[PDB]
Design an enzyme around this catalytic site. Structure first.
Site, mmCIF file in Angstrom:
data_model
loop_
_atom_site.group_PDB
_atom_site.id
_atom_site.type_symbol
_atom_site.label_atom_id
_atom_site.label_comp_id
_atom_site.label_asym_id
_atom_site.label_seq_id
_atom_site.Cartn_x
_atom_site.Cartn_y
_atom_site.Cartn_z
ATOM 1 C CG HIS A 1 5.195 -1.012 -16.741
ATOM 2 N ND1 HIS A 1 4.399 0.105 -16.891
ATOM 3 C CD2 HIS A 1 5.322 -1.559 -17.970
ATOM 4 C CE1 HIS A 1 4.065 0.232 -18.161
ATOM 5 N NE2 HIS A 1 4.604 -0.770 -18.837
ATOM 6 N N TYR B 1 0.819 -1.218 0.000
ATOM 7 C CA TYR B 1 0.000 0.000 0.000
ATOM 8 C C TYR B 1 0.849 1.262 0.000
HETATM 9 C C1 LIG Z 1 0.759 5.036 -9.783
HETATM 10 C C2 LIG Z 1 -0.192 3.951 -10.273
HETATM 11 C C3 LIG Z 1 -1.622 4.364 -9.956
HETATM 12 C C4 LIG Z 1 0.102 2.626 -9.579
HETATM 13 N N1 LIG Z 1 0.013 3.812 -11.703
HETATM 14 C C5 LIG Z 1 -0.649 2.980 -12.514
HETATM 15 O O1 LIG Z 1 -1.880 2.920 -12.480
HETATM 16 C C6 LIG Z 1 0.044 2.213 -13.383
HETATM 17 C C7 LIG Z 1 1.395 2.273 -13.432
HETATM 18 C C8 LIG Z 1 2.286 1.197 -14.033
HETATM 19 O O2 LIG Z 1 3.136 1.818 -15.000
HETATM 20 C C9 LIG Z 1 3.171 0.584 -12.967
HETATM 21 O O3 LIG Z 1 3.095 -0.650 -12.766
HETATM 22 O O4 LIG Z 1 3.961 1.318 -12.325
HETATM 23 C C10 LIG Z 1 1.479 0.094 -14.729
HETATM 24 C C11 LIG Z 1 0.165 0.583 -15.335
HETATM 25 O O5 LIG Z 1 -0.545 -0.531 -15.886
HETATM 26 C C12 LIG Z 1 -0.729 1.300 -14.305
HETATM 27 O O6 LIG Z 1 -1.726 2.099 -14.973
#
Ligand SMILES: CC(C)(C)NC(=O)C1=C[C@@](O)(C(=O)O)C[C@@H](O)[C@@H]1O
Ligand SMILES: CC(C)(C)NC(=O)C1=C[C@@](O)(C(=O)O)C[C@@H](O)[C@@H]1O
Ligand SMILES: CC(C)(C)NC(=O)C1=C[C@@](O)(C(=O)O)C[C@@H](O)[C@@H]1O
Ligand SMILES: CC(C)(C)NC(=O)C1=C[C@@](O)(C(=O)O)C[C@@H](O)[C@@H]1O
Ligand SMILES: CC(C)(C)NC(=O)C1=C[C@@](O)(C(=O)O)C[C@@H](O)[C@@H]1O
Ligand SMILES: CC(C)(C)NC(=O)C1=C[C@@](O)(C(=O)O)C[C@@H](O)[C@@H]1O
Ligand SMILES: CC(C)(C)NC(=O)C1=C[C@@](O)(C(=O)O)C[C@@H](O)[C@@H]1O
Ligand SMILES: CC(C)(C)NC(=O)C1=C[C@@](O)(C(=O)O)C[C@@H](O)[C@@H]1O
Ligand SMILES: CC(C)(C)NC(=O)C1=C[C@@](O)(C(=O)O)C[C@@H](O)[C@@H]1O
Ligand SMILES: CC(C)(C)NC(=O)C1=C[C@@](O)(C(=O)O)C[C@@H](O)[C@@H]1O
Ligand SMILES: CC(C)(C)NC(=O)C1=C[C@@](O)(C(=O)O)C[C@@H](O)[C@@H]1O
Lengths: 134, 135, 141, 141, 136, 136, 139, 134, 137, 137, 141, 135
Positions: K99, K22
């Site tokens: 990611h 979290y």
């Molecule tokens: C900050 C957060 C809300 C977790 N960002 C994302 O939603 C995302 C980020 C990502 O690039 C990630 O894994 O960091 C993946 C993508 O699928 C997703 O939309």
């Protein structure tokens, strides 16, 4: 009557409680109670499984077969099972239909006699029992 | 110790391999007593009727052996009623649904079922009962 | 020769409303038309309708036991039911699938049928005339 | 009056091939005329393996506004050109198939014509051309 | 004004093996109906034929339907066809959010011919729908 | 309770080419809110980033959201993840019945993480969403 | 230079007898030919319902190294043969469609020709052919 | 013995490096040495091809067929060929599987005796020789 | 006679390796060609989808034609399609490159079904030809 | 003038087995025909993937053509393909049954896109024709 | 050497209430974590975040005009934006897709990236270390 | 503290036939040591050999770095072996699996890997090592 029980890749890891050994024993106990002789082998090698399959074809013996991951991926194994003249009962310990989608397909079910899934280790025993009758 | 064996649409027509439905009920009833079980065997072509029966098996916490016939590939309703069961549910097909038409290879029941026996003819039932006798 | 004409769910609502489709002949009229034509063709035609799957199958089982032919308009079931197909696959006598509308000029899901592969034949999109033509085919055998 | 009956690729090999029913194209052509004639209609029945030829026939039927009974052979499942030609027919167009196409390969269960057609008759064999005629006999639109 | 609330397969088993049993849903619908100044009839069956029958009655009585079809939602062309006949409004109601379960629950044969659909606002979808209808 | 009503691309154009316009809509919603002992903030933007900005705030403030994303409904993962953060209810609203149009409007990226979805009930959808929030 | 305008299946049936979707094939030849005049090119406009015939005209262009404006009608969505014939052209090829194919049946949104043509004009009515000519004049 | 070689649309425009005539010459020269008689024809016209297929059906003569584009499109042609009682070898000069995705489906293959792809021009000759041996 | 030539994400980058016209050169070449035909070309480019929408809304309310080349958004934005949907005057979609001679994903347009026509692969010229069309209708 | 003939899983069960020619019988013809053609034919069969790869690695190193009937591995192995993709001299894929006249899933192969060619449905003789092709480079 | 690190939509929301999760290292703590490890390898990290595609696109353009490396975590856009893909495709200098979470362990839609095919490479699932491994790669070539 | 670098089919064949597998082994080793771990690197063409090695990493609770080759796209038996690891598993690919044929864009491993590095050449191995140093 000899029955061939062929466990495929990963099934040696059973219980890592029902270990592969407890499976082997458990199967031989119902085997001998049914007036049958079970030969249980496992291998992580597809080559090896194909070969146990070949033997059982030449010997006209039924096969109980839990191929693990090869169930969903391997045409070669399918093609070796297709020559079996005797019955072939495919088996899964776990319910393959409750998990990932790619597990819901089996190259083996179409050329097999019957399929037992998600009945735990007893799949095997219940399979022997069928093969006692045919 | 009751067990519910339920057969859906068309299973009332077995024998027209050569085992009639009347005959199969007897097989199961006898085989079941041999294992100390009491088999209640029932058949209907009515999807509503199967629901009442599966509903009752939920309330009683009694195990079910279900051969749904064509409803297997089609009724989300049946699946839901079944997902409620707390005792085991064993899905059973007489024939090997996998060596037939492409659409018989999807089941709606399978994912919520304890396990599934296919292609072992009438013995599929007796086997299901045996599993119930152990677990 | 006894010919069974079986109509499925909703079919009891013909022409009376949905009047765009349909066409305008009520179910009661259709019964009369079909009986009339049966007489000229020299067959007896029992016509029956039901929204209940359990009832259709039970009529089909009987057809199978009598080895009587069947003219079936299964309604929505055409596209959905496997039980019914499975019932029909049991008939020794011929099986004629009739659809009043042109199931191919409408929604993509109507363009598939479980019944078509296990039927003698299919007539689609000729209105109520499709029941009578199917009768004709049986009169010849 | 006048219905055009048209047969696409390989219907010349009717018969015969192989055989599998036994009726030849020549006899089917005579059967259809006879039947049309018994109904007060006149049936001009051609067959060609040339798509261009078929489009020439369809164009004319359109210009004359004559109804069309089409069994387009393999072309049922592949030709968008055939479809757009038929689409402009103003008189009923009734697509025919001797055999049950839903009882065979999957590529056979799609028709480019079924959607733009009045209706469809499949698998009632040779009689499907006569039943089509009877539909036309019982209307004029 | 009479609304018809029709519950399909398994819906008679609410509360047994949401929070709310079918009896309490009925009890609630009655009060909300009286708040709104309508008459509402609540029916539940696991029969598709029974369901078709009730829809037919609504079809002939030019009455609104609120339909929670259960699993039939995703599978029944028969029920969609019976409903498409209806001339007063049809509102499709799902208690759970269908789009957050299995992928197959995300397709409904009813949505396309319903006036509208209320999904996963729990038992309150019934009340909110009766409201929409009270305002026509 | 503060409620956010957020409206995505094109929703500014309601009734410019039915009838009811955005300003009017803001007002019915404002009217219904008060009547329900609630306070409503309605806003509209054609900017995904701006919508994300509003969603971020409502997650920080733990306020309820009523969301009509327009076309972004069927296309934006970014929007979906913003909304995934909400702790207070998310209600998805479409004015029209998105299941009786082009096939691609039948997929929503938001519905799965929404509390619920109301579709095809017209402008009354917003006011059924407010009333839902108003209970629990 | 010369430019080949080629119309496939059902295209001789333009105008009335296919009202909208409004000119006849003859009139279209008149329009196309006059617009080529002004542009300083000669247009050779042919229609045929024969796939066989189209391929020969298409082989003849690849031989002469002339450009081609092709409206293949329904063969647009079905014919690999026709595409492989156009694949051969050393001069420019412009697919033309009179109606907006993207606003009709799904099966029309795909073209076997598109990927090998220089470009594609769609939904601009009969002007398509003219706009295509204009394009070719300039190169 | 007679072998019909049927070249479909666009094949009258070869150049492999060899032209269609160079190709008839070559299949004839080879046909001789195996003790066969090869009739080699080419149309851009489906009608013509179906006709040439009917003849071969009637006379029960083997067919080597390179249908060109029609390979991937024509149910009509496939049905004409299904008529043959003597073998049919489908033949593509290029490797149809190393180009566009659509070229990788054929209506003819499921009904032919066998297929030869990618071996160039020389694929006609290998087909001829298979037929020598029946 | 005003004509809206609206350009989407990345067309600012016409440059620049290569198939060698810049955006500013595009605007000018389009503005002078439209005058030859006696239209007024109003050529505007943005990477911002909202800006693009705002300009569709105005063209809707003005009942002016639109030439749109929406760049990547063509393949992805329902939002844009919906703004475009409500135009009353002609809408011609244009792409400089042959979209069908490329990634499978590029062969679907969301704008095509609601546009009057599309022109594709005709280079910078596709613009000029859509002005010609517009002069007639 | 060496040529490798590699036969994958199950192929050593030929003519045993759907009774017609055995695997040994077939090794024989191929050498007979190979000699007749003034090349040398090394003919191997193995059910193990890792072994087939070994043989392929060896052929690539050697710059010697291959004639491969991969059995089931045709439809499922990427690793087989990448091995085969390395060859600088003709690879010829071969099947005995007509793969297109059976299960849908037999109709895609991972090899055909990298093979020099494919011969299907033409029995044991396919090995021979492959050989014949090869004896002209 | 300048390396541009770019974070797209929602990445401003890291840490709290980032979920994920979290936790939780806060977009500010990330910027700090990166310029540091960049200095250590002798690089210049210019770290940026925007919820606005047009803004992302413009940072991408300047990098192209400056021949500078880019480490991109495009968030939701990864999966949906062709516009963003085309901007990145003009990069002469390398592009690493980052990611934080393992995209392949979540929804099917996350397993497709419009960016990966035109990127030098992709790092996935390794958490905030992803960025530093990316700078590392760039410090070599 | 032991890291298991596993290499699959055809990876024995990097180099000309720049980095050879020999060189890749030395690189991994130098780097690992320079980081305070010992890297046991291994190659095989044999699905069954890799399963064996995986099972051993599971039994030791040692991390795995795996470049499974074409088996990434095709082996469920490999995936299930890796599901069993309780320590991190990083999937590696030298090339960009997304800039090649479509079939290469699906990994049976990705879903169960802690992480995945793709297209960063031989360096991907060392970055995965670095990743593991800091857990
Ligand atoms: C900050 C957060 C809300 C977790 N960002 C994302 O939603 C995302 C980020 C990502 O690039 C990630 O894994 O960091 C993946 C993508 O699928 C997703 O939309
Ligand atoms: C050791 C373990 C991971 C449980 N075995 C398996 O891989 C598998 C188990 C199964 O054979 C089984 O349920 O028996 C099913 C199969 O899909 C899967 O590959
Ligand atoms: C009695 C019979 C008519 C054969 N019942 C069935 O239809 C069916 C039986 C099955 O459940 C069965 O194999 O037991 C399979 C199912 O696909 C099929 O529809
Ligand atoms: C009376 C009506 C509701 C139109 N009947 C039907 O439901 C149906 C009619 C049909 O059988 C018919 O077209 O004849 C087809 C079927 O798709 C449909 O469900
Ligand atoms: C091409 C041709 C030989 C005409 N094929 C047929 O005969 C065929 C038979 C049918 O027309 C027929 O039933 O008459 C159906 C059609 O699918 C099939 O193509
Ligand atoms: C793209 C945009 C203009 C926002 N479209 C809409 O307005 C829309 C309205 C809706 O939200 C609506 O029903 O309110 C539905 C949605 O599918 C559609 O995108
Ligand atoms: C004359 C008419 C019958 C309208 N032409 C066409 O059908 C066609 C021509 C088109 O290429 C055209 O729009 O020009 C589209 C194609 O789908 C269609 O088959
Ligand atoms: C333009 C030309 C290459 C002549 N066309 C063909 O001949 C063709 C024949 C082929 O069977 C061949 O490669 O021999 C493949 C087919 O897809 C292609 O269209
Ligand atoms: C500036 C550049 C990056 C070359 N443009 C484009 O990517 C694009 C422009 C296009 O309109 C074009 O082809 O002109 C189409 C679109 O697919 C693509 O995104
Ligand atoms: C030996 C036997 C098992 C009968 N053959 C085959 O099934 C197979 C061999 C083939 O390569 C073959 O036809 O030679 C085809 C392939 O689909 C299949 O795996
Ligand atoms: C370098 C070579 C020996 C060709 N290895 C490979 O085949 C492969 C390597 C990869 O894992 C890789 O590049 O890391 C990708 C995989 O799809 C492919 O099987």
């Amino acid at each position: 009557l000899i029955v061939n029980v062929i466990n495929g890749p990963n099934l040696g890891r059973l219980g890592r409680g029902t270990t592969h050994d407890e499976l082997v024993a458990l199967i031989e106990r119902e085997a001998a109670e049914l007036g049958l002789k079970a030969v249980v082998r496992q291998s992580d090698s597809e080559a090896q499984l194909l070969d146990w399959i070949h033997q059982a074809a030449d010997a006209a013996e039924p096969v109980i077969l839990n191929a693990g991951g090869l169930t969903h991926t391997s045409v070669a194994l399918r093609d070796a099972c297709a020559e079996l003249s005797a019955p072939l009962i495919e088996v899964h310990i776990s319910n393959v239909h409750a998990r990932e989608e790619f597990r819901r397909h089996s190259y083996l079910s179409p050329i097999a006699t019957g399929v037992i899934v998600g009945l735990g280790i007893q799949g095997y025993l219940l399979a022997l029992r069928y093969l006692a009758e045919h």
